[PDB]
Amino acid sequence: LLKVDQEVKLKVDSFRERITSEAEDLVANFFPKKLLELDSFLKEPILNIHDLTQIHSDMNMLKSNQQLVDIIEKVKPEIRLLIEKCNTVKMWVQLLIPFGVSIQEETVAELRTVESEAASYLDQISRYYITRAKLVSKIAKYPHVEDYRRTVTEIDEKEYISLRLIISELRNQYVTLHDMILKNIEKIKR
Amino acid sequence: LLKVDQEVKLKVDSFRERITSEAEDLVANFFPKKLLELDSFLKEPILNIHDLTQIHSDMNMLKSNQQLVDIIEKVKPEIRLLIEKCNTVKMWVQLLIPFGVSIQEETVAELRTVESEAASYLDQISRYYITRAKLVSKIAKYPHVEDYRRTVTEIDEKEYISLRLIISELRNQYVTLHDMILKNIEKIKR
Amino acid sequence: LLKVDQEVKLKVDSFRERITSEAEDLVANFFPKKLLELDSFLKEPILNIHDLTQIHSDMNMLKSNQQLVDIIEKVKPEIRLLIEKCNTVKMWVQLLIPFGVSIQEETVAELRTVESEAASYLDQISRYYITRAKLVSKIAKYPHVEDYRRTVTEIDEKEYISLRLIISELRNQYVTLHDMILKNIEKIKR
Amino acid sequence: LLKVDQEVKLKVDSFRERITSEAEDLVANFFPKKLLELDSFLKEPILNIHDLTQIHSDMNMLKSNQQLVDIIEKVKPEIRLLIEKCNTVKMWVQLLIPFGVSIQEETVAELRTVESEAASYLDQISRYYITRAKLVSKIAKYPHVEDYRRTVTEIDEKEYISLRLIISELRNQYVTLHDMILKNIEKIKR
Amino acid sequence: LLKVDQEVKLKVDSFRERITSEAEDLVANFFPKKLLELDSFLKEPILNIHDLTQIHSDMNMLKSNQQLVDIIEKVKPEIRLLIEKCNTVKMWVQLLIPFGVSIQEETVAELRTVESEAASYLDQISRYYITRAKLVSKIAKYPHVEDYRRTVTEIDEKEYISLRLIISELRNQYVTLHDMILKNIEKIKR
Amino acid sequence: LLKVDQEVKLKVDSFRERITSEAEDLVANFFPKKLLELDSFLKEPILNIHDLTQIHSDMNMLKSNQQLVDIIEKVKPEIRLLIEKCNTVKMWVQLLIPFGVSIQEETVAELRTVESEAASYLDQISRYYITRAKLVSKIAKYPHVEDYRRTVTEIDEKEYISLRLIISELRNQYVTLHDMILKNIEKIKR
Amino acid sequence: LLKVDQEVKLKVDSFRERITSEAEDLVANFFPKKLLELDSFLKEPILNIHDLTQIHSDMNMLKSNQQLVDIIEKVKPEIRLLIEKCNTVKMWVQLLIPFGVSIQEETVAELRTVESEAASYLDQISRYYITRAKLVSKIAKYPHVEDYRRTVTEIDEKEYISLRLIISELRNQYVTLHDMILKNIEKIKR
């Protein structure tokens, strides 16, 4: 009835071994290394501006806020890395064969939530660009209304607080995931 | 009261046998073969670009991003295959006659979820085209606003990360489904 | 207090007998006959095109996709038949007088779900026409944007995969309903 | 503290008697009579057209589909009658004084659901007119797009299947309500 | 720590006595009197028109339906009275000091629901005016489309069935509330 | 590890004492005083108009309804006072240290609901102004449609019934809150 | 299998110590200091205006309300500080290793809710600017409608009550969080 070609099965077994090796190295070495790198990034001066008047840009309908754009470019690669690394670790947890079954399900759900939240971060950076564009377009059509000029300054300041929250939250995820997977794996294995 | 013509019943029984044979071959041979093919596809250079500056396209309102379009064309057939193959396997699980009843219901629900998620992937590729079109149309109407030019570059980069996530997720589904159906079928049969 | 004219009651009893006879014949003979007809329809070449480049239509804002329209015309009568036949069977289950009561309620709920899903299929065919029309209208207003031309090709391809899914799903419903009603009726009757 | 004028109380008691008499006659005689009338209406040729090409109307932006309008005019009075008759029966169930209390609550909830569904039927007939109007208006603004012409034909065909479903469903409600109220009243009274 | 001026407390006690007296008279006398008045109103010829062709108004974009407007003016005061009277009774139930506590909570919830539903009735009369206005405005912009003329006739007929349902439902509330409060108060008091 | 500067702690303790004193006086004296003031306000002639024809304003697109605006100005300060006073009382309940714990949580939830409802009242007054403005703007663009003139009269009448409901509801909150906090505090303290 | 480089582990341990020290100082000293500062801010005259006629600004489409803008500028830094400080404390609670486990989860959930509410406050300040702008734009297009002029005055008054509610609510959070974390930490540690 159901049987597998030995040659195909052997090649599949190598895939299982490769995923396991990548996951063990990622949790043991990559996750800790990133926590140190992100903590230093928060300390850097660009993400620690005391007064938000400086981030504001000057217009007469054209230039985007250059200071904010540069911060976004540094943030985007880090969000992408968490999404790619998390997917590999999640598959390793699912592949592992085990009370123990319940613990494994909790770990997969927790990893799944981190992946979904990361996508939200990428989406919010995209939403800021479209929203700022609509308001900047509005200023040209109705020059006299002061509030339209005021809203564009507010959207720039809100993004700065938000981007710092994303970097801190990604650093939080690495330490929390590292500790949780290490404690849970011993129970899941047995 | 209720009785069936023998000739009609015999022809129906052949349909039941045909569906069962296709399902056993699909789980035992097709699902494993695809996992190997998709894993190689991820390794290929086009899906592994290190810097997302290269994927960006240059405009003066016309050409779509050629590099992204080519990647989408390769991804679409694979999503279609999972939808067609999953439907045949789901019917086999429903047809099987069996604690055992509960296990069978779990398998049908799990297969149903994979089918619905696959449709979502096809929908997101469609949404990207309509959204990019609206933003490209906006650039022509309001040339001066820089943010509108910035949003179209962002939508191209977001799609690249998303398409790679779809290929990895489809590879994840094949290994997870193969293992789950094989373990569950022994219990369902008895 | 409450009593019924004998002449009116006799005519009502004939209605009850007529509905019962139609239902028994429909489950025993019509449902099996349709499963065979639909399975052959899937095998036919029009619903099995290997490459979706062929289904694409050529425009300079006018002609709809002729190949897709012809497939839709064949699909619509089959969806209509399931809705009409299911309503008659559902009334027979409700009329039957019976643990047994719970089984009867499950059957009515299952029949009700199949009826609602069938209406969804008719609605999706309608939505495709309105959506394709809006996008085709957009191409004329903004000729230069390539993405608008690309979206109309994508909507045609998505519909082809969807229509085949509807025919396969209707075939799935007939076999599942036939088996479920036959097993459940013995328990419901007793 | 709390007491009622005898003259006012006597007049109220006559209202209670009148509602009870109308309800007993409606369930015993009106509900059965309607089931016979609606069953004959379904048999009539206008509601049984084999091919939906005939219902389609011919345009060059003006005339509504005459065949569909005539069917709607016959359907509207029947939906109105169920709403008015159901309200009187529901009040009788609430007035009755009684395990028995739970049975009474189930009957009121079931009667309430039938009343709400009937309102939905009246609403859908209204929605078809507004939707067809918008699409017919669109054809004039953009004559070349064929899909806009195709959608108006589809909306006419969908309505025909829907109107027949309403007549069959109203016939279903009468038989189901008649049987349920008669069985439940004996328990509710005691 | 916490104590109240005797003079202020005495004046508050008079408020409590006044609310109690108004509530007892309203449930014992006002609620029954209204049930008789509304029942006669339903019997009156204007609310009982057999054919809905008569309610239809004739236009060449100007006059509202005079017959419908007159019916609405009679209905609006009655809906307002239920809202004002119900609020006073609800406060009396809350003030009463008492198994008994649970019964009191059920009565307040039931009174609260009647108050909210009454507001819905006032809202629907308002919605009809805005909706009819938009459709009448549409007829002038696009004279040729017949369906726009058809929709305005349909909205008038739907309102007539709805207004009669409101008057019957308000009559239903008075009898149901009268009976429920009288039965519940004895338990709540003890 | 964790310790507090004595000087800072002493100043914080004075804040705790001040909040407690304000709350005890507010529940014992302010809440009762307001109930008497609001009850007299309802008795005043402006809020008791018998016929709603008088509130209607006469237009030829300009003046707002003066009678309604004056009533709104009196209502707004009272809604603001409940929001400010409720916040202080809620903090006192949270600060109190205690079966007893559950009673305290119920009181905070009840106080929180009253605060949220009060904000809704302020929002509805704002919505009326924007909605009336849109309809008044519509009358000028399309002078002939009578229904647009009719809707503006209806929105004025609906607001009058609504404003009286707000004043009565605020009076209801004061008596209910006074009684509930006094009964609950003895249990919470012990 | 899983092991960590000693040098990397030592650097991570220093991160854990640094976060713990910052959290203990923040709860013991920063949270109490802020409560005193905010309480004085509420006492200041600008946030205590008796009549809201003064906050209103005079227009002939141009100037924003200067008095309101100045109040917003003072409020924004305080909301930002709570978001940044709360994130550090939340990580300390998660890092702590412990009935005790349940208490820790409650504290993290409570801290998470305070962080989300703070973001809502920043969002509402942004919404006021966009909404006031749209209404101010409307006044210019349609000068005659008085209600549009009335709505802009109402939006200014609503914001003043809202900003004072934010400052009071932030002061409430500091005292509640300080007390809760101090009581919970002893149980969480043991």
Neighbours of chain A (3+ CB pairs under 8 A): B, G
DSSP state of G53: T
Tokens of G142: 């349609």
A87 with B32: Cβ contact below 8 A: no
Tokens of D14: 């006559």
Do residues D141 and C133 touch, judged by C-beta distance below 8 A? Answer: no
Whole-number Å distance between alpha carbons of F91 and F79 = 19
Whole-number Å distance between alpha carbons of G114 and G175 = 12
Tell me the nearest-neighbour CA distance from F134 into chain G, angstroms. 9
Per-residue exposure over A76-106, b if at least 16 CB sit within 10 Å of its own CB, e if not: bebbbebbebbbebbbbbbeeeeeeeebbee
Contacts 24+ apart (CB under 8 A), B6-15: B8/C29, B8/C32, B8/C33, B8/C36, B9/C32, B11/C36, B12/C32, B12/C35, B12/C36, B12/C175, B15/C35, B15/C36, B15/C39, B15/C175
E111 φ/ψ sector (left φ>0, alpha ψ -120 to 50, else beta): alpha
Contact partners, residue C181, CB within 8 Å, separation at least 6:
C27, C89, C93, C107
Neighbours of chain C (3+ CB pairs under 8 A): B, D
DSSP string, C34-71: HHHHHHHHHHSGGGG-S-TTTT----------HHHHHH
Whole-number Å distance between alpha carbons of G166 and G124 = 10
B8 with C33: Cβ contact below 8 A: yes
Sign of CA dihedral C31, C34, C40, C43: negative
Whole-number Å distance between alpha carbons of C158 and D182 = 52
D91 with E182: Cβ contact below 8 A: no
F168 with E87: Cβ contact below 8 A: yes
The type of residue at D133 is A
Do residues E137 and F145 touch, judged by C-beta distance below 8 A? Answer: yes
Experimental method: cryo-EM
Contact partners, residue C178, CB within 8 Å, separation at least 6:
C27, C31, C32, C35
Tokens of D165: 């479903």
Residue pairs between chains A and G whose CB atoms are closer than 8 Å: 81
- Chain E partners within 8 Å of D63 (Cβ): 146
C133, C148, G141, C149: which is closest to B138 by C-alpha?
C148
In whole angstroms, how far apart are CA G125 and each of A160, G61, G149? 16, 20, 21
Contact partners, residue D38, CB within 8 Å, separation at least 6:
D78, D167, D170, D171, D174
Which residue precedes each gap in chain C (C to N above 2.5 Å)? 60, 98
DSSP string, C141-182: HS-S-HHHHHHHHHHHHHHHHHHHHHHHHHHHHHHHHHHHHH
In whole angstroms, how far apart are CA F116 and each of F86, F87, F120, F123? 10, 11, 7, 11
* Nearest residue in chain A measured CA to CA from B35: A12
Whole-number Å distance between alpha carbons of A111 and B169 = 14
DSSP state of B52: T
In whole angstroms, how far apart are CA B158 and each of A64, B11, B41, B118, B124? 20, 51, 20, 19, 12
Give the per-residue SS3 of chain E.
CCCCCHHHHHHHHHHHHHHHHHHHHHHHHHHHHHHHHHHHHHHCHHHHCCCCCCCCCCCCCCCCCHHHHHHHHHHHHHHHHHHHHHHHHHHHHHHCCCCHHHHHHHHHHHHHHHHHHHHHHHHHHHHHHHHHHHHHHHHHHCCCCHHHHHHHHHHHHHHHHHHHHHHHHHHHHHHHHHHHHHHHHHHHHC
DSSP state of G2: -
Tokens of C172: 């799935």
C12 φ/ψ sector (left φ>0, alpha ψ -120 to 50, else beta): alpha
- Both ends of chain D: CA-CA distance in Å? 32
B91, B78, B69: which is closest to B17 by C-alpha?
B91
Cβ of residue D1 closer than 8 Å to a chain E Cβ: yes
Other CB atoms within 10 A of residue A148 CB: 24
DSSP string, A27-39: IIIIHHHHHHHHH
* Nearest residue in chain E measured CA to CA from F175: E95
Alpha helices by DSSP H, B47-145: 66-95, 100-141
Q: What are the phi and psi torsion angles at C143 (to 5°)?
A: -65, -40
Whole-number Å distance between alpha carbons of G131 and G162 = 15
B126 with C151: Cβ contact below 8 A: yes
Whole-number Å distance between alpha carbons of A166 and G87 = 11
Whole-number Å distance between alpha carbons of C120 and C125 = 9
Judged by DSSP in three states, D21 sits in helix
> Alpha-carbon dihedral of residues G170, G173, G175, G179, nearest 10 degrees?
-170
Do residues F185 and E163 touch, judged by C-beta distance below 8 A? Answer: no
C30, C78, C62: which is closest to C177 by C-alpha?
C30
Whole-number Å distance between alpha carbons of A107 and A118 = 17
Whole-number Å distance between alpha carbons of B94 and B92 = 5
Alpha helices by DSSP H, chain A: 6-25, 31-43, 66-95, 100-141, 146-189
> Alpha-carbon dihedral of residues D136, D137, D138, D142, nearest 10 degrees?
110
DSSP string, C5-28: -HHHHHHHHHHHHHHHHHHHHIII
Whole-number Å distance between alpha carbons of B34 and E148 = 56
In whole angstroms, how far apart are CA B26 and each of B18, B90, C85? 12, 12, 34
DSSP string, G99-123: -HHHHHHHHHHHHHHHHHHHHHHHH
The type of residue at F52 is L
Do A and E have ≥3 inter-chain CB pairs under 8 A?
no
Whole-number Å distance between alpha carbons of C9 and C4 = 6
Other CB atoms within 10 A of residue G50 CB: 7
Whole-number Å distance between alpha carbons of G72 and B75 = 50
Other CB atoms within 10 A of residue E154 CB: 21
F75, F77, F93, F42: which is closest to F159 by C-alpha?
F75
Do residues E12 and F36 touch, judged by C-beta distance below 8 A? Answer: yes
Cβ of residue F190 closer than 8 Å to a chain G Cβ: no
Whole-number Å distance between alpha carbons of G69 and D91 = 59
Whole-number Å distance between alpha carbons of A69 and F161 = 53
How far is C-alpha E3 from the geometric centre of its chain's CA atoms?
42
Contacts 24+ apart (CB under 8 A), A9-12: A9/B32, A11/B36, A12/B32, A12/B35, A12/B36, A12/B175
The tokens 């227009």 sit on which residue?
G59
F76, F69, F82, F28: which is closest to F160 by C-alpha?
F69
Angle value at C-alpha E71, between E116 and F140, nearest 5 degrees = 85
Sign of CA dihedral F156, F157, F160, F166: negative
D49 φ/ψ sector (left φ>0, alpha ψ -120 to 50, else beta): beta
Tell me the nearest-neighbour CA distance from F5 into chain E, angstroms. 30
Question: Taking the domains of chain B in order of start, what are their residue ranges?
Answer: 1-190
D173, D71, D45, D156: which is closest to D120 by C-alpha?
D173
Name the burial class of residue A40, with classes exposed (0-12), middle (13-18) and buried (19+) by CB atoms within 10 angstroms of its CB.
exposed
Tokens of D109: 């909830």
Interface of F with G in 6-65 (CB under 8 A): 8-9, 11-12, 15, 61-64
Whole-number Å distance between alpha carbons of D41 and D37 = 6
Other CB atoms within 10 A of residue G43 CB: 8
Whole-number Å distance between alpha carbons of D117 and D83 = 9
Tokens of D53: 């090409």
Cβ of residue A143 closer than 8 Å to a chain G Cβ: no
Contacts 24+ apart (CB under 8 A), A99-102: A99/A187, A100/A187, A100/A188, A100/A190
Do residues C57 and D146 touch, judged by C-beta distance below 8 A? Answer: no
In whole angstroms, how far apart are CA F170 and each of A65, B140, C73, F82? 48, 55, 63, 8
B11 with C144: Cβ contact below 8 A: no
Judged by DSSP in three states, D63 sits in coil
Tell me the nearest-neighbour CA distance from F171 into chain G, angstroms. 21
* Nearest residue in chain F measured CA to CA from G154: F126
Contact partners, residue A52, CB within 8 Å, separation at least 6:
A157, A160, G76
The type of residue at B136 is V
The tokens 């339906």 sit on which residue?
E65
Alpha helices by DSSP H, chain F: 6-25, 31-43, 66-95, 100-141, 146-189
Whole-number Å distance between alpha carbons of C121 and C172 = 14
